[PDB]
């Protein structure tokens, strides 16, 4: 078997947003950055981001938590809160 | 021990004493089981015909098979009441 870790969740989201094109930069990204302002993402762009977030993690999420994860650390702690890796 | 009590009809037994009436009921009962054993025995033989025959059972024991199917409506429990509660030729 295999067990998820924190830094796995970290490096996945970092390398995830490295492959996206409407990001601002490749060096601005932190563990505490805003998705919207610190990465230049739109209201509509972040939804495509979260779509890739849910597909790449495997796990799917509702719309209720969709505007809950507006910064990177919120999304990391969210996905680490679920036991389905 | 294999005892054999006698057979008593329901005709001319004076339906007031319980002795002859109950004996006649039990006689017409046990004799009906004797009649049933013919059906059971011919079934036991007919299946053995089917066991040995294989394909040609159609012509080996057709008479045994229709013997079974003819005995079927006339070999069962039928009640002592029906002959007791009624009289033919009347």
């Amino acid at each position: 078997a295999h067990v998820l870790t924190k830094d796995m969740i970290q490096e996945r989201i970092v390398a995830l947003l490295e492959s996206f094109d409407k990001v601002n930069d490749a060096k601005n990204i932190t563990a505490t950055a805003n998705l919207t302002s610190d990465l230049g993402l739109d209201s509509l762009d972040v939804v495509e981001v979260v779509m890739a977030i849910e597909e790449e993690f495997g796990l799917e999420i509702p719309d209720h938590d969709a505007d809950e994860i507006k910064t990177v650390q919120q999304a990391i702690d969210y996905v680490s809160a679920q036991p389905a890796a | 021990e294999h005892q054999r009590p006698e057979l008593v009809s329901f005709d001319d037994i004076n339906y007031n004493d319980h002795k002859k009436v109950r004996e006649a009921q039990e006689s017409y009962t046990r004799e009906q089981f004797i009649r049933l054993e013919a059906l059971k025995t011919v079934r036991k033989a007919l299946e053995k015909c089917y066991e040995e025959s294989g394909p040609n059972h159609f012509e080996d024991c057709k008479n045994l098979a229709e013997q079974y199917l003819d005995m079927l409506p006339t070999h069962r429990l039928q009640g002592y009441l029906g002959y007791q509660r009624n009289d033919p030729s009347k």
Binding site: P62, H64 | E59, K62
Partner: protein
């Protein structure tokens, strides 16, 4: 309220609150109720005729309308059986004879009698 019998059960109650029934299976699962097994928060006013809106109620498929889907099923029936009956007019006959049998069709072999030959006999 919702269905026919639901409105045909309204004038019975005298002190029940008459809530709107809704199938709990068709509530979304991602809301976090008390009973996660039944998508049900604790002090929820149950429906008159609860057990057709339980999770233990039958499934109640949601894509097609019931009355609409009945038409699709009978259409599948018709397109099978009618065209199969049409193919009975379009069938070609076969090329050989059905095969015959000796001993006057083996009527003696399937038991039988000369009197009972009519209920036997295969292509003598």
């Amino acid at each position: 309220i919702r269905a026919s019998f639901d409105k045909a059960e309204e004038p019975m109650l005298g002190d029940y609150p008459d809530i709107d029934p809704f199938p709990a299976q068709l509530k979304n699962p991602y809301k976090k109720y008390d009973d996660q097994q039944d998508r049900r928060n604790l002090e929820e006013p149950l429906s008159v005729n609860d057990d057709l809106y339980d999770m233990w109620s039958p499934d109640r498929f949601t894509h097609f309308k019931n009355q609409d889907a009945l038409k699709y099923f009978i259409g599948f029936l018709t397109i099978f059986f009618g065209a199969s009956y049409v193919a009975t007019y379009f069938v070609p006959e076969k090329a050989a004879i059905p095969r015959e049998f000796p001993y006057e069709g083996l009527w003696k072999e399937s038991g039988g009698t000369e009197k009972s030959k009519a209920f036997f006999g295969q292509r003598s």
